[PDB]
Structure 1
Amino acid sequence: MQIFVKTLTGKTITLEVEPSDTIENVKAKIQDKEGIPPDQQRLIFAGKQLEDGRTLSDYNIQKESTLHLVLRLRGG
């Protein structure tokens, strides 16, 4: 189950997350791949803030999902 993370400026990141995982695992994987720390970044889907500490199964995440990434502070 691949998911496209779309950061600002149009950059695409392909990343695999199983359906049973949670948003904390997503942020940890993003730190592992991109190096951004987990607490700093923020994710949004369907124009709705991803509530921390909740599984992605509650959200309507499907195959080839698009999750938009925004960083509070510029350049990480």
Structure 2
Amino acid sequence: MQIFVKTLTGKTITLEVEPSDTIENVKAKIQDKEGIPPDQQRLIFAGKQLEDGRTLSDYNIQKESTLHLVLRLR
């Protein structure tokens, strides 16, 4: 399915994913487009911080829905 990842910098990217994809897996695809290391990414959906080892289906993330990407640096 297609999902969207919003950076609060203003911009958005599309991602191509499966419901069984892990957040880890999503982070890797974000790094491929944005260059941000996975341990400096945090993803937010429906007011929850998403865990690395869990899947999109675990969080009821559906086609054309949107995740929010936040930086955790120092």
- Fold-level match, TM-score > 0.5? yes
Q: Distance in 1 between matches of 2:58 and 2:2?
A: 17
SS in 1 for 2:67: strand
The superposition leaves residues 23-53 of structure 1 with CA deviations (integer Å, 9 ceiling, x where unpaired) of 1110011111111111111000011110121
**Structure 1 unmatched runs, 5+:** none
User: Counting helix residues as a fraction of each chain, which structure ranks higher?
Assistant: 2
User: Displaced runs of 4+ in structure 1, greater than 3 A?
Assistant: none
TM-score (norm 1): 0.89
Q: Distance in 2 between matches of 1:17 and 1:70?
A: 19
Q: Distance in 1 between matches of 2:54 and 2:20?
A: 11
Q: Distance in 2 between matches of 1:27 and 1:9?
A: 17
Aligned to 1:27: 27
Q: Distance in 2 between matches of 1:3 and 1:55?
A: 14
Q: Percent identity?
A: 100
The alpha carbon displacement at 1:8 in A equals 1.1
Aligned to 1:42: 42
The alpha carbon displacement at 1:60 in A equals 1.0
CA RMSD of aligned residues (A): 1.4
**Structure 2 unmatched runs, 5+:** none
